[PDB]
Design a binder for this molecule. Structure first.
Ligand SMILES: [Cl-]
Ligand SMILES: [Cl-]
Length: 253
């Protein structure tokens, strides 16, 4: 449980103009809620898809006077949803947007990243501290596994800052809308993304320990220094490119 609904008309119109929905596109809203974004987005379209977990909230959109005829509604967890299959059915990549429940906001990005070409872009309302993590550069408390994985997959652009008073009820923290665009060309292509995922996982479990300590399991001291990496570095010190280099190393050797 845990839902906060956008109430601010001027913020909503900002988010909507930021998303810039256009007829012909395959928009998919996650957590439409009380139709705060769904209404104004819907008005611009002839067809819309929404995934809403709450049984009552999904039922209400079904009988909405204007949205009703335009909507395909999936009453379920967005985590269990095959977006690739939808993009296949739609015949084009999806523009996913909305306000995912906090409890799945991190896993859903990962889920969505794996469909790669099936997603045109994403506009999400998320906790501020998560937006900080997504866009974080090295040498920061916010820089972590998520930073590296998201930046591997996507251009990450913070779009709008949203204070709690634009929600009923207000949340305990600040929020931000973030745009994520899967890379047309991978800046740091990686032969096996599973390896990058693993390196980052094991690296960031031991943030304080040095890369030499934290992943002496996977790389010898010579391998790291042969890559230009200082073994005395902690996980926060290693650039996104460097992580991708290490992943490419293990896959090729
Ligand atoms: Cl309503
Ligand atoms: Cl992290």
């Amino acid at each position: 449980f845990g839902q906060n609904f956008l109430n601010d008309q001027f913020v909503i119109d900002s988010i909507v103009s930021a998303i810039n929905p256009q007829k012909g596109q395959a928009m998919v809203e996650i957590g439409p809620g009380l139709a705060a974004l769904t209404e104004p987005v819907g008005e611009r379209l002839d067809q819309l898809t929404v995934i809403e977990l709450d049984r009552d909230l999904a039922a209400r959109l079904q009988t909405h006077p204007f949205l009703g005829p335009k909507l395909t509604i999936y009453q379920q967890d967005a985590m269990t949803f095959n977006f690739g299959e939808l993009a296949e059915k739609m015949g084009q990549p999806l523009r996913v947007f909305g306000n995912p429940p906090y409890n799945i906001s991190t896993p859903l990005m990962f889920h969505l990243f794996s469909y790669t070409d099936a997603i045109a872009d994403m506009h999400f309302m998320l906790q501020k501290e998560v937006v900080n993590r997504l866009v974080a550069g090295p040498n920061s408390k916010a820089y972590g596994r998520l930073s590296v994985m998201a930046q591997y997959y996507c251009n990450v652009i913070p779009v709008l800052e949203v204070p709690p008073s634009a929600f009923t009820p207000p949340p305990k923290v600040d929020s931000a809308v973030v745009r994520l665009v899967p890379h047309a060309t991978m800046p740091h292509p990686v032969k096996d993304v599973r390896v990058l995922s693993r390196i980052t996982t094991e690296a960031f479990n031991q943030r304080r320990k040095t890369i030499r300590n934290s992943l002496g399991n996977l790389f010898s001291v010579e391998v790291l220094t042969g890559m230009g990496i200082d073994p005395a570095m902690r996980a926060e010190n290693i650039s996104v490119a460097q992580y991708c280099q290490m992943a490419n190393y293990l896959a090729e050797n």
